[PDB]
C-alpha cells in the first residue's frame, strides 16, 4: 500500500487526462476510486460507490463513495471535485446540504482534505506520494470510540492475566 499504490494512482490520473482528453471529475475520479478501493481490500473494508445516506434534515445525500465494513456499516466517506473549482467553497455547500463529517476525504485532483470528528485533520498535496499515503493511513484506520475503548480493554488484560492466573493456580 502506501507508496506503491499512491504512485500507481499518480500515473493513472495522468493516463486518464491523456488518453481521454477530459479533466472532468466524472472521468478523473476513477483514479482515486481505485486507490481507495485497492487499499480497502487489504484492510478488510470495501469502497462501495454512490451509496445514498440520509442527513439529520431528512435530505437524501449520495457521496461519491462510502467505506463500508463487512457488516454493511459505514466507517468513512469520499467526495471528488474537478481541479476547476475551489475545494474550500464546495466544502461548505456540501456539508450544508447535509454531508457526513465523521471521516470524509474531500478531494480535487490536486489537493486532499481529511475531516475527522468534524474538524480538518490534514490537508495534503496529491502530488506528494508520502504525504497522501499519510492522510490515507489516518482515513482507513479512524475507528469509532466503541472500538477505541475495546482495544484499550484488551491491553488491560495483558497486565491483568498474571493476577488472574494466580487465582486459578491457587484453585488447582
Amino acid at each position: 500500500m502506501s507508496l506503491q499504490l499512491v504512485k500507481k494512482f499518480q500515473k493513472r490520473l495522468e493516463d486518464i487526462v491523456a488518453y481521454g482528453g477530459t479533466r472532468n471529475e466524472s472521468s478523473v475520479r476513477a483514479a482515486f476510486q481505485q486507490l481507495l478501493s485497492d487499499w480497502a481490500e487489504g484492510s478488510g473494508l470495501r469502497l462501495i460507490t454512490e451509496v445514498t445516506q440520509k442527513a439529520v434534515a431528512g435530505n437524501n445525500v449520495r457521496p461519491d463513495g462510502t467505506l463500508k465494513d463487512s457488516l454493511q456499516q459505514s466507517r468513512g466517506y469520499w467526495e471528488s471535485k474537478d481541479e476547476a473549482d475551489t475545494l474550500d467553497d464546495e466544502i461548505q455547500k456540501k456539508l450544508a446540504k447535509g454531508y457526513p463529517r465523521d471521516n470524509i476525504i474531500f478531494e480535487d485532483s490536486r489537493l486532499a482534505v481529511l475531516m475527522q470528528n468534524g474538524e480538518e485533520v490534514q490537508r495534503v498535496d496529491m502530488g506528494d506520494a508520502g504525504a497522501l499515503a499519510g492522510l490515507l493511513k489516518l482515513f482507513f484506520e479512524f475507528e469509532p470510540p466503541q472500538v477505541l475503548e475495546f482495544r484499550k480493554a484488551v491491553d488491560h488484560f495483558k497486565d491483568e492475566m498474571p493476577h488472574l492466573l494466580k487465582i486459578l493456580r491457587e484453585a488447582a
Binding site: 442527513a55 439529520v56 434534515a57 435530505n59 466544502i91 461548505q92 455547500k93 456539508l95 450544508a96 447535509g98
Partner: protein, 171 residues
C-alpha cells in the same frame, strides 16, 4: 424633468446653463426641500418596511454561514419589474417598498439599488488587500443597512413627488 429632457444633448456636452423660470420663490423652496432630503439622508424618517425573517435550511454550522452571506437583490416579477421586496441575505427579507421609490434614478441605478450594490461582499481586486485587509462581513452591517434602506426609501418617494409637482415646460 422637462429641462433634463429638452436640453439633454446640450447637458451632455456643456456645463448646465440655468433658465430664468417665472416664479423663483416656488423654485428655491422646492430646492430647499430637495437638498435637505439629500444631505441629511441619515436623519430622514424611516419609511415603514416589513422585515420578514426565515430560519436556515438545516442546523449545519455551514448553512448559517452560507445564509449570512449577502444577496442584496431586488426581487423582480416575470416582467422584470420590482415586486417591492429585497432579499437582503438568505435569512432577512425587507418588503413593502413603494413602486415610486424605484424612480429616483441617480445614474443608471436607483437610489435604493445604489445602497444595495455598495454593501455587497465583493472580492478586492488588489491581492494584498484580498489576502490581509478583507474584513467586511454583511452580518456586521445588516442592521445599519435595514435602517438606511428605509431612510433612502423616504428620500426616494419624497424626491419623486417634489419633481412631479414641477411644471411640464422649460423656459
Amino acid at each position: 424633468p422637462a429641462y433634463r429632457e429638452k436640453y439633454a444633448l446640450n447637458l451632455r456636452q456643456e456645463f448646465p446653463r440655468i433658465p430664468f423660470y417665472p416664479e423663483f420663490g416656488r423654485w428655491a423652496a422646492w430646492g430647499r426641500e430637495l437638498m435637505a432630503l439629500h444631505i441629511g439622508f441619515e436623519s430622514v424618517a424611516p419609511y415603514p418596511l416589513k422585515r420578514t425573517d426565515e430560519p436556515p435550511k438545516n442546523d449545519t454550522p455551514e448553512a448559517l454561514a452560507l445564509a449570512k452571506k449577502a444577496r442584496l437583490k431586488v426581487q423582480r416579477d416575470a416582467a422584470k419589474q420590482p415586486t417591492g421586496a429585497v432579499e437582503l441575505d438568505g435569512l432577512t427579507t425587507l418588503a413593502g417598498i413603494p413602486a415610486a421609490a424605484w424612480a429616483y434614478k441617480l445614474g443608471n441605478r436607483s437610489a435604493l439599488e445604489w445602497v444595495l450594490e455598495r454593501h455587497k461582499e465583493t472580492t478586492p481586486k488588489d491581492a494584498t488587500i484580498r489576502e490581509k485587509f478583507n474584513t467586511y462581513r454583511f452580518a456586521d452591517h445588516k442592521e445599519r443597512v435595514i435602517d438606511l434602506l428605509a431612510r433612502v426609501t423616504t428620500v426616494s418617494v419624497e424626491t419623486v413627488r417634489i419633481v412631479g409637482e414641477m411644471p411640464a415646460e422649460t423656459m
